[PDB]
């Protein structure tokens, strides 16, 4: 293809492309508000945490760091904020 609209690419292609190779670059990560069982004490956690984030109420580790997205523990209820 030699004629195409570069200013309005389609959502599929821009979500397919790398986060730096889009038209305007932006993060693909997000934030969650997580509840652990027990203390209500909702807490906001990054997608790619890099730390064993626990609630400030108790040592109740919510996510474990991984190479990419953090792995949430089994007893957790998260919402994509």
């Amino acid at each position: 293809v030699l004629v195409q609209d570069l200013l309005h690419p389609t959502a599929a292609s821009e979500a397919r492309k790398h986060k730096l190779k889009t038209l305007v670059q932006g993060p693909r990560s997000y934030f969650l508000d997580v509840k652990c069982p027990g203390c209500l004490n909702i807490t906001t956690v990054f997608s790619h945490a890099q730390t064993a984030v626990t609630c400030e109420s108790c040592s109740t580790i919510l996510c474990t760091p991984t190479g990419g997205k953090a792995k949430l523990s089994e007893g957790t209820s998260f919402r994509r904020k």
Binding site: L2, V3, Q4, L6, L7, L23, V24, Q25
Partner: protein, 129 residues
């Protein structure tokens, strides 16, 4: 590394018009690129171009017609006087009737014939035909 953003822009435009495409994505969109594109657009060599503002340096999407043969840059930006503009044009323009040597003077970025009309010279940026 990336030393001349104007050179990268003009090389991308040259490759695009060689391949026959009607559009090209330019990065990273400086002021001299804007003024160079404005001169080419005023003389009718490209068409409409649009500046995408990200907060880093900007991108530019130019629309390419079929009229551009070669847009080139001159590196380094030589200091060019009034005899020097005609000997330069005789060297690197295809004819004496069309094509423009673009040069940054203290009175803005413009082409050699407008520099002749205003009677002022400066540094040479590039050329277009």
């Amino acid at each position: 590394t990336r030393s001349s953003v104007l050179a990268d822009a003009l090389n991308a435009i040259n490759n695009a018009e060689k391949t026959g495409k009607r559009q090209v994505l330019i990065r990273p969109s400086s002021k001299v690129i804007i003024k160079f594109l404005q001169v080419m657009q005023k003389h009718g060599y490209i068409g409409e171009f649009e500046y995408i503002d990200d907060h880093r340096s900007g991108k530019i999407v130019v629309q390419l017609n079929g009229r551009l043969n070669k847009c080139g840059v001159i590196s380094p930006r030589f200091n060019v006087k009034i005899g020097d503009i005609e000997k330069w044009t005789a060297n690197l323009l295809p004819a004496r009737q069309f094509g423009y040597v673009i040069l940054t003077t203290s009175a803005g970025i413009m082409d050699h014939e407008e520099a002749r009309r205003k009677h002022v010279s400066g540094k040479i940026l590039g050329f277009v035909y």
